[PDB]
Design a protein around this ligand. Structure first.
Ligand SMILES: *[C@@H]1O[C@H](CO)[C@@H](O[C@@H]2O[C@H](CO)[C@@H](O[C@@H]3O[C@H](CO[C@H]4O[C@H](CO)[C@@H](O)[C@H](O)[C@@H]4O)[C@@H](O)[C@H](O[C@H]4O[C@H](CO)[C@@H](O)[C@H](O)[C@@H]4O[C@H]4O[C@H](CO)[C@@H](O)[C@H](O)[C@@H]4O)[C@@H]3O)[C@H](O)[C@H]2NC(C)=O)[C@H](O)[C@H]1NC(C)=O
Ligand SMILES: *[C@@H]1O[C@H](CO)[C@@H](O[C@@H]2O[C@H](CO)[C@@H](O[C@@H]3O[C@H](CO[C@H]4O[C@H](CO)[C@@H](O)[C@H](O)[C@@H]4O)[C@@H](O)[C@H](O[C@H]4O[C@H](CO)[C@@H](O)[C@H](O)[C@@H]4O)[C@@H]3O)[C@H](O)[C@H]2NC(C)=O)[C@H](O)[C@H]1NC(C)=O
Ligand SMILES: *[C@@H]1O[C@H](CO)[C@@H](O[C@@H]2O[C@H](CO)[C@@H](O[C@@H]3O[C@H](CO)[C@@H](O)[C@H](O[C@H]4O[C@H](CO)[C@@H](O)[C@H](O)[C@@H]4O)[C@@H]3O)[C@H](O)[C@H]2NC(C)=O)[C@H](O)[C@H]1NC(C)=O
Ligand SMILES: *[C@@H]1O[C@H](CO)[C@@H](O[C@@H]2O[C@H](CO)[C@@H](O[C@@H]3O[C@H](CO)[C@@H](O)[C@H](O)[C@@H]3O)[C@H](O)[C@H]2NC(C)=O)[C@H](O)[C@H]1NC(C)=O
Ligand SMILES: *[C@@H]1O[C@H](CO)[C@@H](O[C@@H]2O[C@H](CO)[C@@H](O)[C@H](O)[C@H]2NC(C)=O)[C@H](O)[C@H]1NC(C)=O
Ligand SMILES: *[C@@H]1O[C@H](CO)[C@@H](O[C@@H]2O[C@H](CO)[C@@H](O)[C@H](O)[C@H]2NC(C)=O)[C@H](O)[C@H]1NC(C)=O
Ligand SMILES: *[C@@H]1O[C@H](CO)[C@@H](O[C@@H]2O[C@H](CO)[C@@H](O)[C@H](O)[C@H]2NC(C)=O)[C@H](O)[C@H]1NC(C)=O
Ligand SMILES: *[C@@H]1O[C@H](CO)[C@@H](O[C@@H]2O[C@H](CO)[C@@H](O)[C@H](O)[C@H]2NC(C)=O)[C@H](O)[C@H]1NC(C)=O
Ligand SMILES: *[C@@H]1O[C@H](CO)[C@@H](O[C@@H]2O[C@H](CO)[C@@H](O)[C@H](O)[C@H]2NC(C)=O)[C@H](O)[C@H]1NC(C)=O
Ligand SMILES: *[C@@H]1O[C@H](CO)[C@@H](O[C@@H]2O[C@H](CO)[C@@H](O)[C@H](O)[C@H]2NC(C)=O)[C@H](O)[C@H]1NC(C)=O
Ligand SMILES: *[C@@H]1O[C@H](CO)[C@@H](O[C@@H]2O[C@H](CO)[C@@H](O)[C@H](O)[C@H]2NC(C)=O)[C@H](O)[C@H]1NC(C)=O
Ligand SMILES: *[C@@H]1O[C@H](CO)[C@@H](O)[C@H](O)[C@H]1NC(C)=O
Ligand SMILES: *[C@@H]1O[C@H](CO)[C@@H](O)[C@H](O)[C@H]1NC(C)=O
Lengths: 86, 358, 242, 106, 123, 49
């Protein structure tokens, strides 16, 4: 991401306390922030007696939840006070 | 070098047409894991009346597979005309981890004749033919589908009474309509059921001879035959390759009515298979008498984990694809087909990397 | 309990000209009575090592499958047969598994073994790589543990002279471009020198690849029922009560 | 090593052959044996190469023949002018030496 | 093609002798060169060969002169040299300047000697 | 490390007891109380053989 530079300019790489890389000075002179790609936590709502289920997508805004999310892929969704549920 | 008989003596090949629009049909038959559809039985160990997980080469749940069909050739009354096939000869695909094929998928059902828009017929089972090898390119006219050096060729023969397999170099013939001749279109196998499927004398070389009419065989390493019991029972066939050579699987010899696939033969082919194609086949039947044939479906295998239900008879009847969806994973997590109600955690969704930056 | 069969036939090995390293031959034995000593007795062995299996076990236990890979090999090049080799031969001509139990035998051939013929010279490939569609970028092409050289179909049965360069274009299926290779020779010694790789597979099938042993009538399941016994059933050993 | 007859002879007009034997690595596997003709006081000249063909400076009287591990030079309709010392020569590529036979008095 | 050879003569065993020859009618930089010898009463014997400059002009020798004779060439003159660092009485022979070529291709090659020079006597 | 990447303060973690205490908590600000610190090692004299 495009963001404001921190740390000392000579070193190309900016690291966190955990020694993970969190920022970089590019060849074009710009500074970018870097974060690990984020995953989407999931839980399954399962009812034995009616043999059915629903997928609860963690704490996502329900913006990133498309339909056809019933499979890992190697009614639509609605946003609730909990997270996004399909 | 194995003697596989004489070369064909014809001065020309039989013309084969390709009208693809007659084959552009589909009857989806996706893998249904809940019926243990396409499950290969563990080779090393058996079990009984238990539920366990197992890793091996299995198809993905929900995979539609690649459907292939065979058709009758052209005819005018009792005199057969040029052949009629789909564009399979140029359909060269990666072997990867090997594959399985459903055979007789629509046997006993009512269907139609591919080369006749409004001719109904009863659907009967037909066996698929394959060509496999390590390197493939073009023919002399730039058309695709020429395999190089030694190839593994699998040809059901005798009107479905035997399977023949061999490993030889294919030397294209130069006559008209042949792979290395003028006016080349494609190659195909065929049989003429009028005389080849005689009940008292099946032509056990009908398909082999037809093959020879297009390619000569050289430097053969081996040739094997296996017998086939003639019936309309749905069955599965599979092929994989390891350091031990090429393994052939079939449900027929162990679990004919259950579908569990078991290894029945191994071929001494230590040359890595990279590509394969489906061999075209046309039937030179009489215009007044044509049949419909069951489609066959090819599915890819992957190193996947499944939950397997071993019945009291030692056969697998149900399975769970542990990576298909979230609920499926839940059953695998508990190694059981019965999980109590509630809210359970599962594996997260992840985004795969896009174009890299350097 | 073991099934009777036939003894493993190593005549093919001993009845022709030794293969080249990058084009070796593979003999696979299944459902068979083997005798490693019998075979090695015919050779003036120079060395014999194993990994994840003893030199004893390799000649005494039962396997689901036994694979013998044989080829001509200069004795002096043994330094590159190590798993952690430099690479000049190992990464292109011939590699062995490090995940399966394996052995390596290096031996020379005595004058009396006249059934096996002598090659003109030793050959191997030193270079093997692919060129991309731009005809400028190149990427090395290495051989895996149970594979043949990726450019084995390009290189002839022998390297006539060092530096002989070979080339063929690739079809679209492989992404196009070119596959190229180059090899070298080693002078032949007074006596034939040869190498043998052995891979042992367990648990994938009935372990019916065994030594040949005789038996008494007191080693049957019958009449031992109810008693604690040790057992060995088609290579599957253990202890228990039948 | 290559083994040849001490001498080969016949009358002008007759057909004679000069043998050159070895093993599978010399003759059997590859067509790589050549034949030379040397007149007294002169250098040798190439008659046949690769067990197959001759230089355009060589008459049709001279032809090659191979069977098993035996190579030979055939002289069809020999002339008195063909009297010479003939040599059988074996040579492959690298990591090997050139092998000559003892020569044949023809 | 002409191969002009000279530099022979009589040198007592223990001494040394160098032969040389000049090639004309061929492209020197594009041919292989070699030497053979023949003693009275004996057949032909290989001395050694030298590759092209573009190939590093490497050499190979017959066993009878291994470690004693050295070959070299110079494309600025189109000449070839053979130096006999240490002579033996058995080296009494006529030496011949020659060329070496191959037929066929890279897949299946065949080697032979096409041209031979007048030769020179070493004794 | 300041926001500008420059080091402004540091603790020599082997100097004394209190110094080690701050290092032990990886902070320049620790709570009051009585804490354990690395013990004082004994040092040997000339060897005996
Ligand atoms: C196209 O059409 C053909 C028929 O025209 C059809 O093949 C036939 O399939 C049926 C099954 O749908 C076969 O009938 C029986 O199938 C069972 C398989 O197991 C199932 O059924 C048992 C029944 O308890 C269940 O327990 C099990 O879980 C499965 O559900 C076979 O086991 C049967 O075998 C009998 O005959 C054998 C002959 O030697 C005997 O050895 C065996 O013990 C069985 O005999 C018993 O049943 C007989 C039935 O009449 C009876 O007469 C005996 O006395 C005894 O009780 C049996 O196969 C039917 O046989 C198939 N036809 C042929 C010729 O095999 C194709 O499948 C269909 N194709 C498609 C794609 O639909
Ligand atoms: C796996 O399969 C591939 C093919 O699928 C094999 O490789 C092919 O081998 C054949 C020969 O067996 C190659 O075909 C031709 O070989 C000729 C060899 O030289 C002989 O013939 C010439 C003819 O005048 C004589 O002069 C010579 O002395 C020999 O007698 C080549 O000369 C041919 O080249 C032609 O095409 C090139 C293209 O640019 C032209 O430049 C040439 O002038 C000429 O026209 C031709 O090569 C065939 O090309 C090989 N294909 C490939 C891709 O290599 C593999 O060998 C086989 N694998 C194994 C291990 O055998
Ligand atoms: C249908 O195709 C099959 C293809 O296998 C064909 O059978 C094969 O015919 C060829 C001849 O065209 C057989 O090859 C050889 O034929 C000679 C004939 O005298 C035999 O002597 C040879 O015997 C060798 O192999 C034996 C194996 O034990 C040895 O004991 C013997 O010493 C020889 O080495 C050999 O048979 C070929 O073997 C058969 N194939 C089989 C499996 O038999 C068949 O004839 C075709 N059918 C029709 C109607 O055309
Ligand atoms: C693949 O099969 C072909 C055809 O059988 C093999 O080619 C043949 O190889 C043999 C050598 O074993 C050639 O033998 C011939 O013998 C006569 C006898 O006098 C001789 O005069 C010929 O010069 C030749 O040596 C045979 O001609 C040859 N056939 C052809 C058409 O070339 C081929 O070698 C086999 N390939 C492999 C890898 O086995
Ligand atoms: C990357 O971030 C830098 C820093 O914020 C951006 O540069 C600023 O762009 C605004 C646009 O009006 C200027 O007013 C600022 O003065 C710029 N800052 C500096 C230090 O020059 C830069 O444009 C960003 N790049 C992108 C593509 O958004
Ligand atoms: C479920 O439907 C009910 C229907 O009443 C929704 O409640 C209404 O939500 C709107 C959203 O602005 C409010 O303005 C109404 O006053 C709500 N009605 C009541 C009675 O509270 C409810 O939000 C829906 N749930 C979700 C997750 O969308
Ligand atoms: C297969 O396993 C099931 C259990 O997974 C066996 O059924 C149980 O048998 C015991 C015997 O006393 C009963 O107490 C259990 O209540 C049974 N469980 C259920 C769910 O019924 C079944 O008998 C086994 N089948 C065979 C042939 O052994
Ligand atoms: C055979 O012809 C069919 C029909 O044109 C080809 O399949 C089509 O391939 C295109 C490629 O993007 C797809 O978009 C179509 O949906 C495919 N149609 C069908 C019915 O599959 C097929 O690839 C041809 N095969 C060969 C070897 O050329
Ligand atoms: C071998 O056949 C393939 C096609 O099956 C040829 O590749 C095609 O060449 C045409 C030429 O205009 C291109 O338009 C196609 O897009 C190419 N297809 C692919 C997949 O690249 C290939 O060039 C042929 N090779 C030879 C030597 O003729
Ligand atoms: C397939 O079955 C046929 C049955 O006809 C077998 O061929 C017969 O084999 C017997 C010997 O056991 C011969 O006496 C018969 O004459 C053979 N029949 C014919 C028509 O020749 C055939 O061998 C079997 N094939 C396999 C692979 O098992
Ligand atoms: C395995 O091979 C070895 C070597 O050939 C066999 O040992 C020989 O057996 C014969 C039997 O009469 C003895 O005379 C030899 O003296 C034995 N040689 C040695 C070195 O002991 C051994 O018996 C073979 N194994 C089996 C089961 O036959
Ligand atoms: C040597 O080979 C001959 C066969 O020609 C055989 O009889 C003899 O026993 C062999 N000797 C040894 C020690 O193997
Ligand atoms: C086992 O019993 C059979 C019964 O006749 C006998 O022939 C055989 O020799 C016995 N084997 C041993 C090792 O005693």
């Amino acid at each position: 991401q495009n963001c404001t530079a921190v740390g000392v300019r000579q070193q190309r790489f900016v690291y966190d306390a955990y020694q993970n890389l969190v920022g970089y000075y590019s060849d074009d002179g710009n500074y970018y922030c870097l974060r690990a790609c984020v995953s989407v936590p999931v839980s399954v709502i399962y009812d034995k007696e009616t043999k059915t289920h629903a997928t609860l997508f963690g704490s996502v805004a329900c913006e990133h939840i498309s339909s056809t999310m019933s499979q890992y892929s190697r009614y639509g969704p609605l946003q609730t006070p909990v997270g996004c549920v399909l | 070098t194995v003697d596989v008989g004489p070369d064909s003596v014809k001065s020309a090949c039989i013309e084969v047409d390709i009208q693809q629009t007659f084959f552009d049909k589909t009857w989806p038959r996706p893998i249904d894991v809940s019926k243990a559809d396409g499950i290969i039985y563990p080779q090393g160990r058996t079990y009984s009346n238990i539920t366990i997980t197992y890793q091996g080469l299995f198809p993905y749940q929900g995979d539609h597979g690649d459907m292939y069909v065979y058709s009758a050739g052209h005819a005018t009354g009792t005199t057969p005309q040029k052949l009629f096939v789909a564009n399979y000869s140029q359909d060269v695909k990666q072997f990867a981890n090997g594959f399985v094929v459903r055979i007789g998928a629509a046997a006993n059902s009512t269907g139609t004749v591919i080369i006749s828009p409004s001719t109904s017929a009863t659907i009967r089972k037909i066996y698929p033919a394959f060509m496999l090898g390590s390197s493939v390119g073009n023919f002399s006219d730039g058309k695709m589908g020429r395999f190089f050096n030694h190839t593994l060729v699998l040809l059901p023969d005798g009107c479905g009474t035997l399977l023949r397999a061999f490993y030889c170099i294919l030397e294209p013939r130069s006559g008209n309509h042949c792979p290395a001749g003028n006016s080349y279109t494609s190659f195909a196998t065929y049989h003429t059921p009028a005389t080849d499927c005689s009940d008292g004398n099946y032509n056990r070389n009908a398909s082999l001879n037809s093959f020879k009419e297009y390619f000569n065989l050289r430097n053969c390493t081996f040739m094997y035959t296996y017998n086939i019991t003639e019936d309309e029972i749905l069955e599965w066939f599979g092929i994989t390759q390891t350091a031990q050579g090429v393994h052939l699987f079939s449900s027929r010899y162990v679990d004919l009515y259950g579908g569990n696939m078991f290894q029945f033969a191994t071929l001494p082919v230590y040359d890595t298979i990279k590509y394969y194609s489906i061999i075209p086949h046309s039937i030179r039947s009489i215009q007044s008498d044509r049949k419909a044939w069951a489609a066959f479906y090819v599915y890819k295998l992957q190193p996947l984990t499944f939950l397997l239900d071993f019945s009291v008879d030692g056969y697998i009847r149900r399975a769970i694809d542990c990576g298909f969806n979230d609920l499926s994973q839940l059953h695998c997590s508990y190694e059981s087909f019965d999980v109590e109600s509630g809210v359970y955690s599962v594996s997260s969704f992840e985004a795969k990397p896009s174009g890299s930056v350097v | 309990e073991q099934a009777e069969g036939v003894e493993c036939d190593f005549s093919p090995l001993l009845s022709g000209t030794p293969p080249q390293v990058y084009n070796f031959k593979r003999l696979v034995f299944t459902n068979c009575n083997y005798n490693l000593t019998k075979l090695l007795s015919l050779f003036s062995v120079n060395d014999f090592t194993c990994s994840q299996i003893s030199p004893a076990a390799i000649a005494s236990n039962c396997y689901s499958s036994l694979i013998l890979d044989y080829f001509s090999y200069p004795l002096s090049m043994k330094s590159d047969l190590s798993v952690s080799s430099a690479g000049p031969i190992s990464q292109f001509n011939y590699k062995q598994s490090f995940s399966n139990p394996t052995c390596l035998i290096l031996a020379t051939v005595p004058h009396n073994l006249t059934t096996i013929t002598k090659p003109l010279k030793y050959s191997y490939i030193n270079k093997c790589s692919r060129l991309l569609s731009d005809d400028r970028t190149e990427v090395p092409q290495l051989v895996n543990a149970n594979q043949y050289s990726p450019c084995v179909s390009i290189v002839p049965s022998t390297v006539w002279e060092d530096g002989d360069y070979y080339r063929k274009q690739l079809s679209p299926l492989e992404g196009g471009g070119w596959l190229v290779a180059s090899g070298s020779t080693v002078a032949m010694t007074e006596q034939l020198q040869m190498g043998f790789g052995i891979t042992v597979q367990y648990g994938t099938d009935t372990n019916s690849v065994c030594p040949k042993l005789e038996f008494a009538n007191d080693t049957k399941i019958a009449s031992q029922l109810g008693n604690c016994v040790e057992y060995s059933l088609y290579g599957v050993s253990g202890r228990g009560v039948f | 090593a290559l083994t040849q007859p001490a001498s080969v002879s016949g009358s002008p007009g007759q057909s004679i052959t000069i043998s050159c034997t070895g093993t599978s690595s010399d003759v059997g596997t590859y067509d790589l044996v050549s034949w030379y003709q040397q007149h007294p006081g002169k250098s040798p000249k190439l008659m046949i190469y690769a067990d197959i063909k001759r230089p355009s400076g060589v008459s049709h009287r001279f032809s090659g023949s191979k069977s098993g591990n035996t190579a030979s030079l055939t002289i069809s309709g020999l002339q008195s002018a063909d009297e010479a010392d003939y040599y059988c020569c074996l040579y492959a590529g690298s990591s090997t030496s050139v092998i000559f036979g003892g020569g044949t008095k023809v | 093609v002409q191969l002009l050879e000279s530099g022979g003569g009589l040198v007592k065993p223990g001494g040394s002798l160098r032969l040389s020859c000049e090639a004309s009618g061929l492209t020197f930089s594009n041919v292989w060169m070699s030497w053979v010898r023949q003693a009275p009463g004996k057949g032909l014997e290989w001395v050694g060969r030298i590759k092209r400059k573009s190939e590093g002009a490497t050499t190979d020798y017959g066993a009878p002169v291994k470690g004693r004779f050295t070959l070299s060439r110079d494309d600025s003159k189109n000449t070839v040299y053979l130096q006999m660092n240490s002579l033996k009485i058995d080296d009494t022979a006529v030496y011949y300047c020659s060329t070496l070529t191959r037929g066929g291709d890279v897949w299946s090659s065949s080697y032979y000697f096409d041209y031979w020079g007048q030769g020179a006597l070493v004794t």
